[PDB]
A paper describes a structure:
In particular, IFT144, IFT140, IFT122 and IFT121, share the same domain organization, from the N- to the C-termini encompassing two tandem WD40 β-propellers (WDs), an array of 12 to 20 TPRs and, except for IFT140, a zinc binding domain (ZBD). These four subunits are distributed into the two modules; the head module consists of IFT140, IFT144 and the C-terminal half of IFT122 (IFT122C, 706-1246), whereas the base module consists of IFT121, the N-terminus of IFT122 (IFT122N, 1-705) as well as IFT139 and IFT43. In contrast to the head-module elongated conformation, the base module adopts a compact configuration. IFT121, IFT122 and IFT139 together form an enclosed oval-shaped ring with the N-terminal TPRs of IFT139 (IFT139N, 1-694) extending out in a solenoid conformation. The short linkers (~5 residues) between the WD40 propellers and the TPRs in IFT121 and IFT122 constrain the locations of the propellers right atop the IFT121-IFT122 TPR junction to form half of the oval ring. This conformation is stabilized by extensive contacts between IFT121 and IFT122, which bury ~3130 Å2 solvent exposed surface area of the base module. On the other side, the ZBD of IFT121 fits into a helical groove formed by the TPRs of IFT139, constituting the other half of the base ring. Notably, the base module oval ring is sealed by the very C-terminal residue of IFT139, Lys1334, whose aliphatic sidechain sticks into hydrophobic central cavity of IFT122WD1. A salient feature of the base module is that, IFT43, the smallest subunit of the complex, adopts an elongated configuration and traverses the base as a molecular tether to stabilize the ring-shaped architecture. The N-terminus of IFT43 (IFT43N) travels along the surface of the two WDs of IFT121 with the aromatic sidechains of Trp9-Phe11 and Trp33 deeply embedded into the hydrophobic pockets in IFT121WD1 and IFT121WD2 respectively, clamping the two propellers in a fixed orientation in the base module.
Residue numbers in the entry:
A (entry chain F): 1 to 49
B (entry chain B): 1 to 797
C (entry chain A): 1 to 626
The structure:
């Protein structure tokens, strides 16, 4: 099939770089027992001298 | 932990399979063939609904071939951030696919191929935004996901293995000759690693460049790289020999592991708890394909051997880490794994579950009530052991820097009670009704937390000397006589024995200590003194003790199970066979009936007569009267939103006897069932018979059941009930008696006459409900004032 | 907070009319810290860190001139001795081998050697003297010598093992790579003496060069040579700069003969010692932490070398400051940190400050942090179970007080023999002057602007203080000094501990010594029954009721708080909760037919079996309500 069919990452002679879509992004949700590890929250000090 | 086999996907077209990749987010396993045979397919679910699937699944969801290739493929990599799939060939053709929302169609999107060169190892960044491509010539090309080449550098030395740091800031190279070099993300040399693993095999003069090829180097992602106090997260293995583990790249004190096998592939866990090394072993006299599991510290937890006598190349883990895909010759075997899963179940109904965090150092304990659906949380740094009793749970933790272990008791809520400290390594721990026994490799420690009848021996003021609540600790080989109270500084642990102990069992008055050589020692609780010396051919693994201490179950290290009858200085092995057993448990009420589960199949056996198996993917909690409780911990790990329902997780399985009794009850008359129950004469059967008799509004049969059960309070209740006129008050009062006040209130509302409802609510002692009832109902000033005063007193108390 | 000398060895062998002197220049420390080194004119000295005694006799005659620098190799296996004899020796070291130290490889420059440094990773040696600098690699055993234009004085290798930094008394700071190329050059107008590289850290993961110039300044420089702009000024000219492990502290010495400690930002914490002379070299003891090890690690060790010829060792111990009011326990972690821990879920909340925290006091949903010349206050959203902290106000006023407390709309500071009342704005409001030092103060609840308090003096007289009265009310008198005081739930009795660890119970209505106990470390009263008293000695904790025999536990720790059916036990800096069975006092009260008090005790969360037993006992004895 080879819908695009163009050399990428600068492998050929003539510049024929491709455009790959990056819309559909798959992410992994954290476990709730894992999400309770952030109980130790960080609070910097207000340093306005 | 346990490992066993499962479904075996057959050959696509009788071609060898050498590369299998499993995705983490969605299930899409891909295997490469010989004549350009790439196949991506989804896999069957482990557990479906709350029972076996009538269709047994048996459907390959995708199973489509993406050939496009004339030569063979040996690198197939999955993008986890996106849908991209990378596959290369022997002719240096790198093809990247993506998923389009159509009828399971994957089409090419990258067609790049460099001629006159050989690809060795392609890699993706953990963030999924960089691709590293290396060749045998030495050229290294880094490309973004879009397609813009970051840099194409040239290296003098040849390259064989590529790895990426968790932060993607820098990378690791391995040459075919064998050596580790550290490079930055901009292709500048940092340093060369030093190898201490290969001892007596390297050249004595120089160690940086030996002649042993590298098998596999693997860095576990999500691991800290700028710290020193962490479990090891990087592993380097050679072709056949030692493997070294480092907690950091700059570490100079690696951990050594030696395995008698030709290492081919090392893969880390999704959680990082354990890693698997696949390959061939010649210890069996020939070439046998094996996969060995090792902990992060390295202990050789288990070894899986395939039935075929061939190689095992390519190992992938599932997203949850519960299944393993192994490409062996022309098949993709699926190994099922049952982890340790430290858990405890009380007789209250509270379940304590231990969950490991991503730090691999800290643990969270969840106390979930199976009745009130309450959930409490605790955070414990280090966990060694967790055990449960009727109403108390024992936690054994380790303190680092003092070589000490803390053993503490907790109630259902989790409040610590009477925590103690020991210097004995907890190899095997048990906790009976009135004792806690922890056994090291060669020492034994016993502690009493309850006295003889029923009370806690922590607050006692009578005798100056210690009468109840004393701690004993003794040796296994010599010094059979129990010693006096020990201390964390007085007691000595240095002496070591030749015969180490493996497993320990406890009872109300008996104790059993096993030995690796095959000897079992019996001890009496009132005064610890050896009585018998039982002999077993193979070393026990799990062991169990029957109620009344008449029989016991021995499980061997290989998985075989048998029954041993304990007798004075004797040895009787009851023939039962049933090999490859994993779990066994004797009933605490019936002296004979027990339950054993073998390869995800549960069997209820009484008098050496097994019954039909039941498919189950859960762990056995308890065996109560004609009932087995099972809980699915795997879904507990995978909760979407933090709600736990007892109707989904907990399942109860009734024995055939109880099912037949219930069927005969719901079918046959009353007198026949009475004479049938008479032989059994069990408390649960009489209780159910009385409940049914009361439900049908029969009092004669209920009175007979109650006298046969010898319950005076029930007789008083029945005598109180029998002197009633109507048909509605009896039912409501029975409902209130069992456990249900709402049904009684509803029937009272049906029959009207609400003063009985208000009087019953006042009698039961609930003061908020009566206050709600009296408001806007009748306007009684005195009753409302008295109820409000009582409620105020209750709130003040 | 407390600095104590450990062991001192003096070298008085001064030799007049000879260029060999009794001064000590450098003191190398092993990574493990089990061995210590020193250099004197024509000799080296080997010491044990824990106890001061020469494990090996002083070596003489090896170098015919003075020894300028002694360094380890980060692994405790190599020696590097540079001498004014225009030569550098490299020795092999091993504790177990019969020759503990022996020369291995010697080389020589063209002129005198002045400074030396090692590579943490590759163990390469860089030695810089006048007119020359040389690099030595163990594998090749071929030195690379190069010429310069002026004499280098200081060198230091980066913790990554890639960069190198050297300084010259002409004002030039040079940063190079492992190939010795002019990566960066910085020109100053004052000589360079001390340089260091900040340790790698997961929080920072970036290395910068800290250099102390002789114009009373310490400067931070990047890799490219661009200054970070700090340019912190100093009263005295620095001489040596040393970074503690994990980049938490900074030990600075030089003029004024004082060894001071600083944070990596630049905040002064303490001074270590005043040696009455220039301290040429001070070093800190490295520490090793196990995988997941639990330890406070309050102890610190420093080694100082003075110009007179004294090699001294000092031990610094940090005191514990903490506060506990209810459902919260706010304690000071490793310096410049506050950790609030909840006793139920064991969850922690961290607050990081830059300057040293001196006192922590927590009122109702209010936390007060006493930073050096600063006061911070944080509140809590009560509706949410988890606590959210927001800064309503900040106080810039400088206040000095060994004890600080916060009450509703007011602050109390105890300094010397005076008590000062501060408004939240900062202006002083009221003063109280007592005869002797105010040792312990306890805050009792009340109306806003009307909160009372108890005050104990060094003389021993116990006083009461009201905010608006401005007139102390003499409560009672005690002969011995007071260490800690407590009040009952109903303000009926008062437990007071003397300096001799003696506990005494005084009745407020009638001032009489009802109860006396010996060897008591801590004590606490119940907050629900008003009668139970739980006092913890060094090893054993006792709980006592009214006219009842004591109950013993053998619980390891000190009693801090007592709540309904709960006792808090604090060991080191971590504390836990222990439940107590109330059946014994229940039975004892049932013996005397005191059913009301027995029921009150039973209401503290006892098992249902005891409830049934008490119900039966009350029913038998004709008490229908109970």
């Amino acid at each position: 099939m080879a819908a695009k069919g163009k050399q990428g990452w600068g492998f050929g002679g003539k510049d024929q770089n491709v455009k790959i879509d990056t819309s559909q992004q798959d992410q992994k949700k954290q476990n709730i027992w894992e999400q309770n590890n952030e109980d130790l929250i960080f609070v910097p000090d207000l340093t306005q001298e | 932990m346990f490992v066993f086999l499962s479904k075996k996907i057959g050959m696509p077209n009788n071609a060898k399979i050498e590369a299998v990749c499993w995705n983490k987010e969605q299930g899409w396993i891909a295997a490469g063939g010989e004549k350009g045979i790439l196949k991506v397919l989804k896999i069957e679910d482990q557990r479906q609904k709350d029972g076996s699937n009538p269709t047994t699944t048996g459907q390959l969801l995708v199973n489509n071939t993406l050939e496009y290739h004339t030569s063979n493929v040996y690198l197939v990599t999955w993008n986890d951030r996106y849908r991209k799939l990378t596959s290369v060939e022997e002719n240096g053709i790198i093809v990247v696919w993506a998923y389009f929302r159509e009828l399971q169609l994957w089409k090419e999107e990258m067609i790049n191929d460099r001629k006159k060169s050989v690809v060795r190892d392609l890699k993706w960044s953990p963030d999924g935004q960089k691709v590293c491509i290396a060749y045998e010539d030495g050229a290294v090309i880094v490309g973004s996901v879009e397609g813009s080449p970051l840099w194409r550098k040239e290296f003098p030395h040849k390259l064989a293995l590529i790895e990426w740091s968790p932060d993607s800031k820098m990378m690791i190279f391995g040459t075919p000759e064998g050596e580790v070099r550290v490079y930055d993300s901009q292709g500048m040399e940092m340093q060369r690693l030093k190898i201490h693993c290969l001892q007596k095999l390297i050249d004595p003069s120089k160690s940086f460049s030996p002649d042993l090829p590298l098998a596999a180097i693997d860095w576990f992602p999500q691991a800290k790289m700028y710290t020193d106090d962490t479990p090891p997260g990087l592993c380097i293995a050679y072709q056949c020999g030692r493997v070294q583990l480092m907690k950091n790249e700059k570490d100079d004190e690696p951990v050594l592991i030696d395995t008698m096998m030709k290492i081919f592939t090392v893969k880390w866990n999704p959680s990082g708890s354990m890693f698997a090394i696949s390959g061939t072993q010649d210890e069996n006299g020939e070439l046998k394909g094996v996969v060995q599991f090792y902990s992060n510290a390295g202990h050789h937890l288990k070894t899986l051997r395939v039935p075929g006598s061939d190689r095992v190349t390519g190992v992938s883990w599932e997203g949850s880490g519960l299944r393993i895909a192994m490409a062996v010759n022309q098949a993709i075997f699926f190994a099922n794994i049952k982890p340790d899963h430290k858990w405890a179940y009380m007789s209250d109904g509270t379940l304590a579950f231990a969950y490991q965090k991503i730090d691999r150092v800290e643990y969270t304990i969840i106390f979930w009530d199976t009745i009130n659906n309450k959930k409490n949380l605790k955070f414990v740094k280090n966990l060694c052991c967790l055990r449960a009793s009727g109403d108390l749970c024992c936690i054994v933790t380790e303190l680092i820097g003092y070589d000490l272990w803390q053993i503490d008791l907790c109630n259902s809520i989790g409040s610590p009670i009477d925590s103690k400290q020991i210097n004995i390594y907890p190899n095997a721990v048990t906790m009976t009704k009135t004792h806690i026994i922890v056994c090291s490799q060669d020492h034994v420690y016993a502690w009493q937390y309850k006295n003889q009848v029923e009370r806690l021996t922590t607050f006692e003021q009578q005798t100056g000397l210690r009468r109840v609540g004393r701690e004993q600790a003794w040796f296994i080989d010599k010094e059979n006589d129990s010693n006096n109270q020990y201390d964390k500084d007085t007691y000595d642990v240095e002496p070591q024995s030749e015969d180490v102990i493996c497993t320990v069992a406890a009872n109300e008055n008996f104790l059993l200590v096993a030995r690796i050589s095959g000897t079992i020692n019996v001890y009496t609780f009132p005064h610890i003194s050896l009585e018998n010396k039982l002999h077993i051919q193979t070393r026990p693994s799990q062991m169990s003790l029957n109620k009344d201490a008449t029989r016991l179950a021995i499980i061997d290290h290989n998985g075989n199970l048998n029954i041993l009858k304990i007798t004075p200085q004797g040895d009787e092995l009851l023939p039962f066979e049933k090999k490859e057993c994993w779990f066994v448990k004797y009933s605490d009420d019936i002296p004979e009936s027990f339950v054993f589960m073998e390869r995800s199949r549960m069997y209820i056996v009484n008098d050496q007569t097994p019954e039909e198996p039941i498919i189950t993917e859960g762990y056995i909690c308890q065996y109560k009267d004609f009932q087995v409780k099972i809980v699915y911990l795997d879904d507990i790990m995978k909760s979407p939103d933090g709600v736990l329902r007892k109707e989904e997780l907990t399942l109860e399985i009734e024995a055939n006897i109880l099912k037949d009794i219930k069927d005969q009850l719901y079918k046959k008359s009353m007198q026949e069932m009475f004479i049938v129950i008479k032989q059994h004469d069990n408390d649960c059967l009489w209780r159910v018979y009385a409940k049914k008799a009361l439900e049908d509004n029969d009092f004669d049969s209920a009175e007979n059941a109650f006298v046969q059960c010898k319950d005076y309070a029930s007789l008083k209740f029945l005598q109180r009930v029998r002197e009633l006129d109507d048909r509605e008050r009896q039912r409501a009062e029975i409902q209130c008696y069992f456990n249900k006040v709402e049904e009684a209130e509803e029937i009272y509302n049906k029959i009207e006459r609400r003063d009985l409802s208000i009087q019953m609510r006042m009698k039961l002692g609930d003061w908020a409900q009566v206050v709600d009832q009296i408001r806007e109902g009748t306007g009684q000033d005195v009753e409302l004032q008295k109820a409000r005063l009582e409620l105020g007193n209750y709130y003040a108390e | 907070m407390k600095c104590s000398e450990l062991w001192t060895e003096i070298i008085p062998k001064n030799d007049p009319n000879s260029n060999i002197t009794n001064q000590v220049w450098s003191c190398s420390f092993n990574n493990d810290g089990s061995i210590l080194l020193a250099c004197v004119g024509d000799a080296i000295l080997v010491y044990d860190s824990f106890t001061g005694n020469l494990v090996n006799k002083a070596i003489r005659g090896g170098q015919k001139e003075q020894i300028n620098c002694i360094k380890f190799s980060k692994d405790g296996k190599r020696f590097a001795t540079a001498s004014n004899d225009k030569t550098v020796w490299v020795w092999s070291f091993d504790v177990n081998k019969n020759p503990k130290l022996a020369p291995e490889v010697k080389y020589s420059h063209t002129d005198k050697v002045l400074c030396l440094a090692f590579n943490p990773l590759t163990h390469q040696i860089f030695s810089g003297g006048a007119q020359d600098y040389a690099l030595w690699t163990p594998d090749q055993q071929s030195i690379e010598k190069s010429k310069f234009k002026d004499k280098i004085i200081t060198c230091a290798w980066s913790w990554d093992g890639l960069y190198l930094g050297f300084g010259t008394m002409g004002g030039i700071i040079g940063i190079r790579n492992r190939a010795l190329e002019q990566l960066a050059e910085i020109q100053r107008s004052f000589p360079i003496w001390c340089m260091d590289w900040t340790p790698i850290t997961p929080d920072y993961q970036n290395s910068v060069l800290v250099v102390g110039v002789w114009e009373q300044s310490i400067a931070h420089y990047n890799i490219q040579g661009q200054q970070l702009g700090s340019d912190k000024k100093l009263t005295y000219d620095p001489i040596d700069i040393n970074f503690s492990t994990q980049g938490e502290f900074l030990l600075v010495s030089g003029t004024n003969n004082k060894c001071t400690l600083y944070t990596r930002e630049g905040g002064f914490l303490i001074d270590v010692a005043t040696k009455n002379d220039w301290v040429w070299n001070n070093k800190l003891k490295p520490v090793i932490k196990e995988a997941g090890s639990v330890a406070v690690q309050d102890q610190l060790h420093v080694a100082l070398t003075t110009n007179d010829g004294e090699i001294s060792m000092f031990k610094i111990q940090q005191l514990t400051v903490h506060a506990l009011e209810g459902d919260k326990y706010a304690y000071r972690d490793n310096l410049t940190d506050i950790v609030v821990q909840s006793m139920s879920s064991n969850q922690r909340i961290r607050l990081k400050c830059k300057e040293l925290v001196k006192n922590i006091s927590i009122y109702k949903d209010k936390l007060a942090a006493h930073l050096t010349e600063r006061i911070l206050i944080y509140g809590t959203s009560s509706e949410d179970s988890q606590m959210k902290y927001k800064l309503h106000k900040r106080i810039v006023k400088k206040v000095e007080a060994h004890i600080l407390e916060i009450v509703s709309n007011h602050l109390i500071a105890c300094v010397k023999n005076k008590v000062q009342l501060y408004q939240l704005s900062g202006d002083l409001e009221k003063e109280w002057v007592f005869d002797s030092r105010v040792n312990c103060i306890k805050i009792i609840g009340g109306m806003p602007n009307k909160e009372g308090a108890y005050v104990g003096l060094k003389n021993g007289q116990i006083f009461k203080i009201f905010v608006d009265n401005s007139f102390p009310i003499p409560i009672l008198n005690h002969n011995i000094s007071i260490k800690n005081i407590d009040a009952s739930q109903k303000r009926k009795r008062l437990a007071v501990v003397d300096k001799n660890s003696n506990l005494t119970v005084y009745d407020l209505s009638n001032k009489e010594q009802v109860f006396q106990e010996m060897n008591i470390v801590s004590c606490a009263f119940n907050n629900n029954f008003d009668d139970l008293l739980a006092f913890s000695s060094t090893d054993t904790t006792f709980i006592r009721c009214s006219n009842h025999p004591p109950l013993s536990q053998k619980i390891s720790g000190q009693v801090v708080g007592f709540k309904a059916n709960k006792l808090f036990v604090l060991n080191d800096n971590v504390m836990s909760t222990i439940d107590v069975s109330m059946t014994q006092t229940m039975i004892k009260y049932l013996e005397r037919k005191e059913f009301q008090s027995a029921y009150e005790i039973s209401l503290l969360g006892v098992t249902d079996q005891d409830f049934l037993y008490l119900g039966n006992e009350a029913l038998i004895a004709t008490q229908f309500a109970i």
